[PDB]
Amino acid sequence: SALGKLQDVVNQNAQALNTLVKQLSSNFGAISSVLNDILSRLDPPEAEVQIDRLITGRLQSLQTYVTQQLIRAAEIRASANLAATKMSECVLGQSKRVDFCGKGYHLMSFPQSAPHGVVFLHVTYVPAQEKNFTTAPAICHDGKAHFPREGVFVSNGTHWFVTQRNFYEPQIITTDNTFVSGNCDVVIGIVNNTVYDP
Amino acid sequence: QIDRLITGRLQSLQTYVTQQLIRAAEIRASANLAATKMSECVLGQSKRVDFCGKGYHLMSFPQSAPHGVVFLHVTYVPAQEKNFTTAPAICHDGKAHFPREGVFVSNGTHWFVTQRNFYEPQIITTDNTFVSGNCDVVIGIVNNTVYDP
Amino acid sequence: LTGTGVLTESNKKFLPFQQFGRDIADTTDAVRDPQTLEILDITPCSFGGV
Amino acid sequence: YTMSLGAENSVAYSNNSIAIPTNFTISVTTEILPVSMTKTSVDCTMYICGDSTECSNLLLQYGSFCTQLNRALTGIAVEQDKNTQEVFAQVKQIYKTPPIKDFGGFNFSQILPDPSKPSKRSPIEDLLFNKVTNGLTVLPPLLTDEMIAQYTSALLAGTITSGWTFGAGPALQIPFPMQMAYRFNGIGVTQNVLYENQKLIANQFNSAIGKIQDSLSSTP
Amino acid sequence: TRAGCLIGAEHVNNSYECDIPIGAGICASYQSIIAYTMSLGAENSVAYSNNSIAIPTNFTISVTTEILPVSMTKTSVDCTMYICG
Ligand SMILES: *[C@@H]1O[C@H](CO)[C@@H](O[C@@H]2O[C@H](CO)[C@@H](O)[C@H](O)[C@H]2NC(C)=O)[C@H](O)[C@H]1NC(C)=O
Ligand SMILES: *[C@@H]1O[C@H](CO)[C@@H](O[C@@H]2O[C@H](CO)[C@@H](O)[C@H](O)[C@H]2NC(C)=O)[C@H](O)[C@H]1NC(C)=O
Ligand SMILES: *[C@@H]1O[C@H](CO)[C@@H](O[C@@H]2O[C@H](CO)[C@@H](O)[C@H](O)[C@H]2NC(C)=O)[C@H](O)[C@H]1NC(C)=O
Ligand SMILES: *[C@@H]1O[C@H](CO)[C@@H](O[C@@H]2O[C@H](CO)[C@@H](O)[C@H](O)[C@H]2NC(C)=O)[C@H](O)[C@H]1NC(C)=O
Ligand SMILES: *[C@@H]1O[C@H](CO)[C@@H](O[C@@H]2O[C@H](CO)[C@@H](O)[C@H](O)[C@H]2NC(C)=O)[C@H](O)[C@H]1NC(C)=O
Ligand SMILES: *[C@@H]1O[C@H](CO)[C@@H](O[C@@H]2O[C@H](CO)[C@@H](O)[C@H](O)[C@H]2NC(C)=O)[C@H](O)[C@H]1NC(C)=O
Ligand SMILES: *[C@@H]1O[C@H](CO)[C@@H](O[C@@H]2O[C@H](CO)[C@@H](O)[C@H](O)[C@H]2NC(C)=O)[C@H](O)[C@H]1NC(C)=O
Ligand SMILES: *[C@@H]1O[C@H](CO)[C@@H](O[C@@H]2O[C@H](CO)[C@@H](O)[C@H](O)[C@H]2NC(C)=O)[C@H](O)[C@H]1NC(C)=O
Ligand SMILES: *[C@@H]1O[C@H](CO)[C@@H](O[C@@H]2O[C@H](CO)[C@@H](O)[C@H](O)[C@H]2NC(C)=O)[C@H](O)[C@H]1NC(C)=O
Ligand SMILES: *[C@@H]1O[C@H](CO)[C@@H](O)[C@H](O)[C@H]1NC(C)=O
Ligand SMILES: *[C@@H]1O[C@H](CO)[C@@H](O)[C@H](O)[C@H]1NC(C)=O
Ligand SMILES: *[C@@H]1O[C@H](CO)[C@@H](O)[C@H](O)[C@H]1NC(C)=O
């Protein structure tokens, strides 16, 4: 049941065609469902009535089929527009849109052809093996508040480090990866730690 | 007589099913849009303009509604703007300095560098500027000192 | 008037001239029985999808 | 009258002047999107004919029209449930908020579920539910209102306690001011601005959420 | 059930994932056929506190499939030949 989405479209189209042709076997209240039988068995004054009943029944069946095909074509067009958007934004580039190109942080995507369809293999980055750390919004040093330039302040219990947000890579808190804004009296939850100067 | 009633009622039922399918397509499109908003505004922060509210989108909250969803978009709107005199680059020591992340502003007498979406003036230093070329190429470069820590 | 349904007691205050009642579909929903003049509610027999 | 398009504003453009914001407003806006319809099923034979055997015998002369209509209505009915699954059932973990609502001044009582209500809905969701009022059958939705509210509660707990981490993998806890600072960096504003003005930002957020509830309660 | 009367399926008090949807929160499965209230998911209380963060120490490169239909079978019907031969 992996490729059920394509199979449903194929089955619906084949079933619609099958039902439309099955509608020819119905007489729609006439004496027979066959036009040739009416032409060989009856005179034209009654034959016009019988073919009129068959014509209105078959025309109603064909109009119903065309309407269903138009609605399904609109649905498939919407799906194809979505697939073209995924081809542009997941395969030809890296997308920041959450869950548009797979579950997780999207890295890349690969297109594969399928019968009346496309299969996108979304290669994504999933975080794993997370660990607790004690965190602080800012570091107080020399009466100044230090904030991380790109990472986050973490503590393993005794020492404070700065690391990137999506992977644990502890580094010494220096003046190169932090910036100074204001004193320590304003930021709620600022902790005291040294800031190394290269 | 029953045939006349059957054809009338069958036409009515087919008509009802036809607009039900059209409305189903419309509701399906709206639900796909709502699922996209739930994925991109609630489960992440979206850079798409006006997709998750008016303003710079911060976060979003989903709320259930009868046959629907209500998104509370929390966005950041700039306010209390102030005029400043700006320059593309700072000329110092025969070199052109450009902001790494901010913009050069002047309150009338002194030049500073600030972030683009909030006024926070800072001293123009080498830490927040980068050097590319001399002062002869950039149109509108102004003369100001660049502090060295 | 022919039909199928369950005949039950009713609390509909029919006016003296009034004999039967009709729903939106125009199908009869209540009737006044002759001979005894009582008002019987007509509720369609249980049906549904299997 | 001839309708106005907008208030006229002339932008003071010049080649060497810029406008820099000195303040901000935390604005909460509502967006209402329909998800599903009422699942309706129509018995084609009963609608056209009722209990008449002769009518059904004459209806069989027209073929499989009734099967087509029932199949289309069944497809619509399952499509509504699929729509509700796609919108609300995007998490396989039911996250819960901590009992202590210490989020650094941020108040979420108007959007978190109310324990006092038997429906386990938020006050905003309760107000939203209060403000919305012959062969035919109405099928109930697969997800009831309390389970949809539970899904929204799980999404709210995930986005409050974990930010966007739960949507991309395991839910990683983070303090809410730090998460807000991350969001501030996403829109290009430094963390210091959020931390220095944290009480003001929390107050503005609470005021905006209250204004949302008042606006929903005051607009028909 | 709110959806209607269910005959032949035993009702259990345990909650599982939805296998066959019945309606009104009721789903059915085979294990005899059982009927149950569908479990939305596993409970996961995130250990929130005002000064603790969770940082990933590892990662998984996950590849997922997304199947999207693009086209249908191009069918043409001769209206005169269909109705009249
Ligand atoms: C937190 O991490 C730091 C850095 O990895 C640890 O400090 C080191 O600990 C080892 C183990 O005894 C020592 O050999 C090193 O000399 C330490 N380095 C420094 C610079 O002091 C620290 O022990 C960790 N703390 C905890 C509680 O795990
Ligand atoms: C972090 O360091 C600052 C200063 O080094 C500490 O602030 C001092 O606190 C004591 C007692 O509260 C006061 O008597 C001093 O006047 C404060 N000095 C300044 C400059 O503010 C602060 O308490 C330290 N915090 C922690 C958690 O160790
Ligand atoms: C532009 O801003 C700077 C910095 O805020 C102002 O410089 C300070 O002005 C105050 C008030 O006159 C003085 O007390 C300080 O000594 C000044 N600092 C320095 C380093 O000179 C400056 O006045 C502002 N200019 C205008 C026109 O508003
Ligand atoms: C900015 O500074 C530069 C150099 O300090 C100025 O360039 C000099 O301008 C004088 C006056 O026109 C000339 O005589 C020199 O030959 C120029 N030197 C160079 C290296 O170009 C420049 O005019 C200053 N601009 C402003 C607006 O003050
Ligand atoms: C920046 O300066 C410009 C011009 O000095 C200001 O633009 C004027 O604003 C007033 C007040 O509405 C209008 O009556 C004028 O017609 C505007 N002039 C032009 C040329 O547009 C502008 O308001 C200033 N910006 C701020 C934030 O004060
Ligand atoms: C930025 O705007 C906020 C309001 O959005 C200002 O906060 C108000 O400050 C005044 C006086 O300081 C108080 O009377 C109001 O009650 C405050 N309102 C709120 C909602 O807190 C804030 O002062 C502004 N800051 C700057 C620098 O302009
Ligand atoms: C969070 O917000 C709620 C509602 O906005 C606050 O509850 C109000 O508390 C005050 C005083 O306790 C009462 O007078 C109001 O009637 C309460 N409102 C409602 C709707 O119950 C609540 O105090 C805020 N703070 C916390 C920490 O929950
Ligand atoms: C971070 O610490 C918290 C609490 O110290 C951990 O949460 C507990 O995890 C155990 C293991 O399943 C549960 O039995 C407790 O009920 C949890 N407590 C709370 C309050 O949620 C959490 O697992 C730690 N995180 C990591 C990655 O180890
Ligand atoms: C991060 O996770 C990967 C697997 O997801 C770890 O790689 C495994 O390491 C163990 C022990 O070293 C081996 O027995 C396995 O064969 C490795 N698997 C693969 C696919 O290479 C890796 O060691 C983890 N890294 C850390 C630092 O924990
Ligand atoms: C966190 O909460 C504890 C109480 O549980 C309090 O002592 C501490 O000051 C708080 N820290 C911050 C940064 O709010
Ligand atoms: C801006 O226009 C003025 C004339 O109005 C001109 O003197 C000045 O050089 C221009 N600056 C730039 C950067 O184009
Ligand atoms: C016969 O019907 C009349 C009303 O038409 C009623 O008044 C009378 O009581 C009935 N008599 C009997 C014996 O049912």
From Swiss-Prot, chain A:
Stated consequence of mutating D8N: In strain: Delta/B.1.617.2, Mu/B.1.621
Coiled coil: 7-51
Recorded consequence of changing T85I: In strain: Gamma/P.1
Glycan-modified residues: N132, N156, N192
Disulfide partners: C90-C101, C140-C184
Listed result of changing D176H: In strain: Alpha/B.1.1.7
Protein purpose: Subunit of the fusion protein that is processed upon entry into the host cell. Mediates fusion of the virion and cellular membranes by functioning as a class I viral fusion protein. Contains a viral fusion peptide that is unmasked after S2 cleavage. This cleavage can occur at the cell membrane by host TMPRSS2 or during endocytosis by host CSTL. In either case, this triggers an extensive and irreversible conformational change that leads to fusion of the viral envelope with the cellular cytoplasmic membrane, releasing viral genomic RNA into the host cell cytoplasm.
Name of the protein described by the UniProt record: Spike protein S2'
Shown part of the complete sequence: 943 to 1140 of 1273
From Swiss-Prot, chain D:
Top-level lineage group: Viruses
Gene assigned in the entry: S
Its biological purpose: Precursor of the fusion protein processed in the biosynthesis of the S protein and the formation of virus particle. Mediates fusion of the virion and cellular membranes by functioning as a class I viral fusion protein. Contains two viral fusion peptides that are unmasked after cleavage. The S2/S2' cleavage occurs during virus entry at the cell membrane by host TMPRSS2 or during endocytosis by host CSTL.
Effect of N134K: In strain: Omicron/BA.1
Residues of the full protein shown: 695 to 942 of 1273
Name assigned to this protein: Spike protein S2
SS bonds (residue pairs): C44-C66, C49-C55
Glycosylated residues in this chain: N15, N23, N107
Record site feature (Cleavage), residues: R121, S122
Organism annotation: Severe acute respiratory syndrome coronavirus 2 (2019-nCoV)
